Amino acid sequence: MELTPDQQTLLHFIMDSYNKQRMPQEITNKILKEAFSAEENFLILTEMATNHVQVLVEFTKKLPGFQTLDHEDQIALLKGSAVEAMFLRSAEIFNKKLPSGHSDLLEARIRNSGISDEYITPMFSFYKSIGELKMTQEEYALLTAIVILSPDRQYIKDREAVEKLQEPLLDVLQKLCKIHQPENPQHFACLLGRLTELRTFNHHHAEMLMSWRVNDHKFTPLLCEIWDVQ
Amino acid sequence: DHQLLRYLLDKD
Numbered sequence: 001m002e003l004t005p006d007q008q009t010l011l012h013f014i015m016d017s018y019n020k021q022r023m024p025q026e027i028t029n030k031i032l033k034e035a036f037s038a039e040e041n042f043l044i045l046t047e048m049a050t051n052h053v054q055v056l057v058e059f060t061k062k063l064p065g066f067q068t069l070d071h072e073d074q075i076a077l078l079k080g081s082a083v084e085a086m087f088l089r090s091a092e093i094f095n096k097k098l099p100s101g102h103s104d105l106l107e108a109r110i111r112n113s114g115i116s117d118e119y120i121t122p123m124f125s126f127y128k129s130i131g132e133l134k135m136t137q138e139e140y141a142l143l144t145a146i147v148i149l150s151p152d153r154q155y156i157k158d159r160e161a162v163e164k165l166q167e168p169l170l171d172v173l174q175k176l177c178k179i180h181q182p183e184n185p186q187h188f189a190c191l192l193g194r195l196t197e198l199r200t201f202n203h204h205h206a207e208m209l210m211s212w213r214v215n216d217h218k219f220t221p222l223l224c225e226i227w228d229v230q
Numbered sequence: 231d232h233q234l235l236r237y238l239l240d241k242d
């Protein structure tokens with residue numbers, strides 16, 4: 001019923017690794033501070049996204065069991081979840097408590113960041129869907145780990161090995177949901193349901209970036225490998 | 231070839 005000693009160890013351990021990320025305040029601070037041109041915004045995105053991938057790799061490598069996976073599967077897992085993890089982290093930052101009105105400003109800044117209207121709709125649709133879940137810090141971290149250790153990812157040769165690693169994280173997440181939100185016996189399933197919506201950002205991610213309202217679309221060497229651009 | 235990713239996954 002309650003978390004075992006081992007499950008608390010895993011949770012805290014995963015929480016420690018997740019905290020190594022760039023703090024939410026840092027992101028929202030710069031966005032709210034001053035309106036940037038679509039040019040400056042695109043450059044902010046690439047630098048933010050490059051840092052996020054670097055930290056994501058270090059986070060992934062510390063996930064219990066990931067080191068014993070086939071080297072090519074390791075690559076396949078990171079390459080397949082990098083974009084989803086980035087939008088999930090954006091969702092967390094977007095729905096974080098800010099002073100009155102600020103949330104409207106942040107949303108307005110992003111809406112006019114230079115991103116194509118074509119993609120502004122689904123992105124905010126997902127962001128809002130996430131906010132309605134009243135997720136905790138531990139939930140975001142677990143969900144991100146679950147996203148990374150997805151066995152049903154492409155090019156994965158040994159899916160059973162990945163499954164074994166994802167199971168314990170799901171069990172912990174499930175217990176958390178049944179505790180932090182006893183009133184909603186659908187919270188856990190609803191968290192898992194957002195992951196499918198999260199996957200839709202994969203197919204038209206490159207188009208989303210290339211359609212940025214700027215003249216030049218330059219990315220970092222690391223982003224070129226992880227994303228499908230340039 | 232994903233050599234940057236491969237590097238980060240090996241010796242940082």
Ligand SMILES: O=C(NC1CCCCC1)[C@H](C1CCCCC1)n1c(-c2ccc(Cl)cc2)nc2ccccc21
Nearest residue numbers: 027041044045048049052086089090093094110113
């Ligand atoms: O810095 C950002 N993301 C970081 C990615 C890496 C993880 C940290 C967050 C940008 C930021 C928006 C404004 C224009 C500059 C770029 N950002 C996005 C976002 C918009 C479009 C794409 Cl294609 C991807 C993400 N959603 C956000 C919600 C809240 C705050 C910032 C958010």
